Paper text:
Based on these observations, we made H175K mutation on the SUR1-Kir6.2 fusion constructs, in which the C terminus of SUR1 is covalently linked to the N terminus of Kir6.2 by a long linker to ensure the correct 4:4 stoichiometry between Kir6.2 and SUR126, yielding the H175Kcryo-EM construct. We purified H175Kcryo-EM protein in detergent and supplemented Mg-ADP, PI(4,5)P2diC8, and NN414 into the protein for cryo-EM sample preparation. The focused 3D classification revealed that the KATP channel core has obvious conformational heterogeneity at the bundle crossings of the Kir6.2 channel, showing a close to open transition at the gate. Residues on the M2 helix tightly seal the pore at the bundle crossing. The side chains of L164 and F168 form the gate, where the radius of the narrowest restriction is below 1 Å. In the closed state, the side chains of F60 on IH pack against T171 on M2 stabilize the closed pore. In the closed state, there are ADP densities inside each nucleotide-binding pocket of Kir6.2 CTD. The binding mode of the adenosine group of ADP is similar to that observed previously. The cryo-EM density maps showed that in the same sample, inhibitory nucleotides exclusively bind Kir6.2 in the closed state but not in the open state. Conversely, the wedging of nucleotide inside the nucleotide-binding pocket of the Kir6.2 channel would block conformational changes that are required for channel opening, providing a plausible mechanism for Kir6.2 channel inhibition by nucleotides.
ATP-sensitive potassium channels (KATP) are metabolic sensors that convert the intracellular ATP/ADP ratio to the excitability of cells. Functional KATP channels are hetero-octamers composed of four Kir6 and four SUR subunits. Kir6 are inward rectifier potassium channels that require PI(4,5)P2 for maximum activity. The SUR subunits bind to activating Mg-ADP and drugs, including insulin secretagogues and KATP openers.
Numbering used by the authors:
A (entry chain B): 1139 to 1286
B (entry chain B): 2 to 50, 61 to 275, 281 to 329, 337 to 621
C (entry chain A), D (entry chain C): 32 to 356
Write the structure that this text describes.
């Protein structure tokens, strides 16, 4: 995760610096997206912190339900309580699975918003660089740098 | 000033002495009529007009896909109309304003269809039917006139109005399929679909199987949850119940059907084939979404090629200039718009792929957990009483091994869709560069045996790491449970030293894994640099086929980066794969253990 | 704690799970009057503007098809005179539909399609004008905000009149216009449970208003103290001053249904009184006095109460104390 | 087996042998509003079109009689300017009657008959416009489809409340607009026979609704369980669970008569309950719950019933069992 984070967080700042060098006007459009991102990180982080915690607090009665089943297997099978404990497992598994599903869908919500912001970054940088190269000459090589 | 047909030759375009139907720029005036009819018949119905039990009409997925394609083709028609009228001094409103009116009409039509589908009003769909019929007529006349003046396929507007009439006919066929299935017109009216049983009374709040494709891909239904988490903490009441397709019992019965189909036992290979038979259809769906995302990811470098090539640098017909497909593709801004749309579609598909894979893994986890518990209720205590297995290992079959198999099922569609992306990327590299790209691909290929050697060493190191970590966790558990006896006998340091010895073996295996991981990362980060260097030196010093140019160089740079991005995570991929193989093997060992005889 | 009716008199009932089959869709006119004045004004301007624009596109298409938009050399009678662009057709559609008829642009008798579309636009414009006139008249003649001048006291009072321990109120009419056939319907809303086991969460039990010979009708000019005697049959028979706090589920709802004299449409003023808003041992201060000219109502004392010595027992205990004596 | 009222609430009574003396003919306006919207629209367009065509033939006959249709050499003032054919007279009749007045065609003051027929056409057009505006306003202000949002449960339930064996129902209001002065009128329809020998095929005996102090009025916001106590005076006193099948002739009809708050016109929702649609030993599930904001009504459970242990005897047998104890 540290290697992936270093590569991502340095390619992002390198790319923003490159687009700011070839098109300074992009900085004017860099401000609202950084606003919009912030609002998304305002709304997701409250929800996800719940949905992670609810995913953890539903994993504890599942795993412990295994731990008491293995050590008390003779007792459960002596009372003929196999079906009741399997039903308890079905309840615990359903709770943990739907907590994980809501965490997954919240993550997909956030990633859809961030990737659409990235597509907007591409569109804005392309518009600024193409308008420059048709108006104020960029030698047609810095445009490829900014788009790449 | 601001005339519908441009004031050329003293407004000669408005002269309709030659058969007004075959007079051009009047058929473009005829095209506005269905769109404004739909707007004026739809805006009061939508404006004048909660349903937790919503259903979906037949052809719902197809209608949303056809509407998206219709919006894309109308955007292309607006772009080519703006391109076409930019030469004449008078602005021709008939070239882009009917296409924009069509775009607004299609947006209003899909909003009307969504409100009808969430309100279950099929009898109003007749109105949409009339609009599509009118649109079809007003397109096909135009197409016929474009055939009668010999436009041909060399002009983009002819292909775009052919796509327009094809999509209008397809939407008309979807509408007549809807009236065939659900008879909302004067008929017997026999068919009632009814809401799905999970939505109507069970109390599920995970609406992802039940939302339309726009809210299925953008995850719009999550929005309210993201709002309500500000006002109230999310608990197990705000999260509903699992759907029937996502329930643990359903996936467990599906896995049991797969295992019974295999038997008509256990082992790792049979477990893998059972997981294939139970969940590979969803895995194929996620792989298809990832394949489409990979294909649309190449629209980036091609658009960079076209844009930078244009920045480095025709037929009059019926009194209005026409644009060829080559002129439309090579005029900078349009590519940017296309790139933006392609990027949006790609991201949506990619997120869909991820979601489907993760959903599949969660279902797999539930099934596996149920099967493990059903083995526990049929287990024998002699397995634990003779040291064949311990309760910590049985609990780690759920806490650790099922998680490893689940994360490998997360990572499966990327591995399935990687070779198609590699093949298309190498083909496009040859298309942009030439033989230099073949040399660079040969440089990439020449280190593949070294990559395979590093991957095998990583797999062996992670097998040793898992083997030592299980023993370390077993010794740590038996030390922690009997801590009072170890303190009373002053044997805490001895058992701590034994756990340190097992941890030292694990750290030796981890050091081997980290050394070969660093070798893999250096190889997969020096392969792109050496490949790019050898291509861009051989493209000028060795070969003289073409100039270097910024378009070719930066498009090939984007293609090289896109092709080498999956190679960055080789260590994590091989670690997850070998952890899955170990997990499936010990799951098969546990499921094929002794039982209690009846 | 939720209230069935607010103090202003709007219900807080939230409807859900209504499977809709178009019975909200058939009554376009009732929904059209139910909208707010900005929404009705928006629909009113949008329907007329969209009809003018639609027939404008029809007239402009006729002028395109006949050749009137092209510069004619001469001896060519257009379908409509003086139509040269889309704005000419739009001004002509406004002239036809609002029946202004400036006459620079007019229908010639050459094209039969122009005559037919003139007929169609006149019929459609008459339909739209009649529907909008009726909807606006129903919107103006609504008595919903006449009911806002029917004021109810903030507190309600349980005290003794003729040794009965009645629950009393105060209802006043601010305007001088009479409200004809004014009837008072008082109810008690609680979560009553039957002895068999049925639980009704909002069981409404009407209570009789002790005014006249068994009638709900009142004559409201001056403010009236409207009281219900807590006898044996009343649901408030077991009510005690140890009750009537905020946590208690008792609610008492008063409806004043009448006909406005000036508009002739029935209206109702709803009000609710929670348990903590019902005061035990008080009494409403008199507000009407004989002034020099005539009777005067002091509305500054309209809801004022004064503490009066009442028993702190329930009504059944007071009845049992009478039975012992 | 025929039903007096349908489940939707339309009567299935077929009238015949009505000797007609013109009392269906005098009330043109009531029949004109009774027609469907296509029929009212057809009469609305046909009356205006026929009036325009009739006065068009009058104007064209004037232009024929005065010599205006003939090509005049000059110095001849027509009765109406620019009338050259029948279509000119038709456009001029449209211009006069809808008061557009384009002014290419206009009445000159030469012919007094043209002035008189201008007066006659203006008076007739004002009459037609006023009658059609009033009929369209009455057509839009109808509360017939406001009553379609007043829902009644599919089944009705006979069970015990406070040991009484009452027959209960469920009435709900879908819209948030109030229905003022809502009254419930319940009846029992059977083929009752008198002891003297009189047979009434559809004898309607009203049953009292046990809600309030002897009143038919209800306050309908949330859905209400409307019950009638089967006491000694009720016609259902001898009803048994061995009855209430499809072959039984028992019918129970519920009328909800109220005034719509927004339109101010009285309406009624009729419903019928056959014997096989009345369930013995059930009970309506509660649907109103205190949500986080306010009260919420779950309309997905609106007609749901649950089986509750009730005696399988008639009401008179239960009363006799109480008399024995
Ligand atoms: N002067 C007044 N004008 C209008 N309404 C009044 C007036 N006085 C009291 N009310 C009504 O009585 C209620 C408040 O009663 P309360 O505050 O006890 O009376 P006061 O303000 O005289 O002490 C309000 O809901 C209001 O509708
Ligand atoms: N959600 C609802 N919306 C509108 N009307 C309803 C609803 N639920 C029940 N009704 C009314 O109740 C009757 C059907 O009752 P029933 O089918 O027993 O209720 P449910 O469908 O809840 O089981 C219908 O005639 C209908 O008018
Ligand atoms: C991050 C991006 N640029 C890039 N990627 S790279 O393939 O590592 C490589 S190698 C070499 Cl020499 C020059 C470059 N430039 C923009 C794709």
């Amino acid at each position: 995760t540290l290697e992936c984070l270093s590569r991502s967080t340095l390619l992002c700042v390198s790319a923003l610096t490159v687009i700011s060098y070839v098109t300074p006007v992009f900085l004017v459009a860099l401000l609202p997206l950084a606003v919009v991102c912030y609002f998304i990180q305002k709304y997701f982080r409250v929800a996800s912190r719940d949905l992670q915690q609810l995913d953890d607090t539903t994993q504890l009665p599942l795993l412990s339900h295994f731990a008491e089943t293995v050590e008390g297997l003779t007792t459960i099978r002596a009372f003929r309580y196999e079906a009741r404990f399997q039903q308890k497992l079905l309840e615990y598994t359903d709770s943990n699975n739907i907590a994980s599903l809501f965490l997954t869908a919240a993550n997909r919500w956030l990633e859809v918003r961030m990737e659409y912001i990235g597509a907007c970054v591409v569109l804005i940088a392309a518009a600024t660089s193409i308008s420059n190269s048709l108006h104020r000459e960029l030698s047609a090589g810095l445009v490829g740098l900014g788009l790449t | 000033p601001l005339a519908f047909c441009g004031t050329e030759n003293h407004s000669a375009a408005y002269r309709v002495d030659q058969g007004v139907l075959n007079n051009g720029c009047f058929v473009d005036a005829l095209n506005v009529v269905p769109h404004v009819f739909l707007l004026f018949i739809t805006f009061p119905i939508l404006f004048i007009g909660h349903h937790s039990t919503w259903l979906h009409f037949p052809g719902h997925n197809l209608r949303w896909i056809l509407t998206f394609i219709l919006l894309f083709v109308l955007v292309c028609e607006i772009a080519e109309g703006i391109l076409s009228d930019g030469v004449t001094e008078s602005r021709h409103l008939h070239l882009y304003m009917p296409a924009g009116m069509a775009f607004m009409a299609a947006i209003t039509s899909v909003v009307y269809y969504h409100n009808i589908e969430t309100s279950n009003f099929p009898k109003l769909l007749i109105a949409l039917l009339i609009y599509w019929t009118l649109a079809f007529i007003t397109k096909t006349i135009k197409f016929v006139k474009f055939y009668d003046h010999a436009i041909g396929f060399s002009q983009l507007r002819f292909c775009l109005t052919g796509l327009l009439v094809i999509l209008y006919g397809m939407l008309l066929l979807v509408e007549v399929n809807v009236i065939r299935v659900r008879r909302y017109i004067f008929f017997k009216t026999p068919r009632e679909v009814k809401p799905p049983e999970d939505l109507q009374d069970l109390g599920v709040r995970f609406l992802q199987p039940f939302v339309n494709l726009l809210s299925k891909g953008t995850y719009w239904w999550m929005n309210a949850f993201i709002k309500t988490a500000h006002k109230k903490p999310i608990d197990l009441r705000a999260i509903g119940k699992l759907p029937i397709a996502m329930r643990a019992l359903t996936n467990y019965q599906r896995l049991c059907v797969a295992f019974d189909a295999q038997a008509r036992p256990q082992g790792a290979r049979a477990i893998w084939r059972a997981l294939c038979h139970a969940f590979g259809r969803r895995l194929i769906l996620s792989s298809t979404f990832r394949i489409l995302a990979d294909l649309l990811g190449f629209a980036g470098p091609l658009c960079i090629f076209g844009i930078v090539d244009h920045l480095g640098k025709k037929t009059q017909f019926l009194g209005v200039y026409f644009v060829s497909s080559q002129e439309f593709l090579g005029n900078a801004y349009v590519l940017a718009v296309l790139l933006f749309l392609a990027l949006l579609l790609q991201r949506t598909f990619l997120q869909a792929s991820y979601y489907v894979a993760i959903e599949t893994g969660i279902n797999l986890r539930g099934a596996i957990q149920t099967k493990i518990y059903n083995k526990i209720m049929h287990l024998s205590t002699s397995n634990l009483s003779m040291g064949e297995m311990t309760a910590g290992q049985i609990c780690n079959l759920v806490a650790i091994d099922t998680n490893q198999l689940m994360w490998f099922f997360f990572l499966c569609p990327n591995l399935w869709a990687m070779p198609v992306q590699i093949i298309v990327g190498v083909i496009l590299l040859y298309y942009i560069l030439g033989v230099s790209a073949l040399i660079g691909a040969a440089v990439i290929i020449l280190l593949a045996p070294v990559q395979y050697f590093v991957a095998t060493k990583l797999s062996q190191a992670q097998r040793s790491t898992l083997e030592h970590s299980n023993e370390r966790l077993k010794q740590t558990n038996e030390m922690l449970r009997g801590m009072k006896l170890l303190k009373l006998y002053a044997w805490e340091s001895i058992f701590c030293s034994r756990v340190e010895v097992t941890r030292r073996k694990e750290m030796t295996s981890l050091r081997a894994f980290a050394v070969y991981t660093s070798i893999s990362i250096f190889m997969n980060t020096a392969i792109p640099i050496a490949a790019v260097l050898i291509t861009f030196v051989g493209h000028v010093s060795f070969f003289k086929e073409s100039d270097l140019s910024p378009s070719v160089a930066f498009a090939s740079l984007s293609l090289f980066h896109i092709l080498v991005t999956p190679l960055f995570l080789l260590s994590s991929v091989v670690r997850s794969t070998v952890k899955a193989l170990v997990s499936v093997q010990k799951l098969s060992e546990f499921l094929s253990s002794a039982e209690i005889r009846e | 704690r939720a209230r069935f009716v607010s103090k202003k008199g709007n219900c807080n009932v939230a409807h859900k799970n209504i499977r809709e089959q178009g019975r909200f869709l058939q009554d376009v006119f009732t929904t059209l009057v139910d909208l707010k004045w900005p929404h009705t004004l928006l629909i009113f301007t949008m329907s007329f503007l969209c009809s003018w624009l639609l027939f404008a596109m029809v007239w402009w298409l006729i002028a395109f098809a006949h050749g009137d938009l092209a510069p004619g050399e001469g001896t060519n009678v257009p379908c409509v005179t003086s139509i040269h662009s889309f704005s000419s057709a739009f001004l002509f559609s406004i002239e036809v539909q609002v029946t202004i008829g400036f006459g620079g642009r007019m229908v010639t008798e050459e094209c039969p399609l122009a005559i037919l579309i003139l007929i169609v636009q006149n019929i459609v414009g008459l339909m739209i004008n009649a529907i909008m006139l009726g909807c606006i008249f129903m919107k103006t003649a609504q008595a919903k905000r006449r009911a806002e001048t029917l004021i109810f006291s903030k507190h309600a009072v349980i005290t003794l009149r003729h040794g009965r321990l009645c629950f009393m109120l105060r209802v006043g009419d601010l305007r001088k216009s009479m409200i004809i056939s004014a009837t008072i319907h008082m109810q008690v809303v609680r979560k009553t449970t039957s002895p068999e086991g049925e639980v009704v969460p909002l069981h409404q039990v009407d209570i009789p208003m002790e005014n006249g010979v068994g009638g709900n009708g009142i004559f409201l000019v001056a403010p009236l103290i409207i009281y219900h005697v807590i006898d044996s049959n009343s649901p408030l028979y077991d009510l005690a001053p140890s009750d009537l706090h905020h946590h208690q589920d008792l609610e008492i709802i008063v409806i004043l249904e009448g006909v406005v004299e000036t508009t002739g449409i029935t209206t109702q003023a709803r009000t609710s009184y929670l348990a903590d808003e019902i005061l035990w041992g008080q009494r409403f201060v008199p507000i009407v006095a004989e002034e020099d000219g005539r009777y005067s109502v002091d509305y500054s004392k309209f809801g004022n109460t004064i503490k009066v010595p009442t028993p702190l027992c329930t009504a059944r205990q007071l009845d049992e104390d009478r039975s012992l004596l």
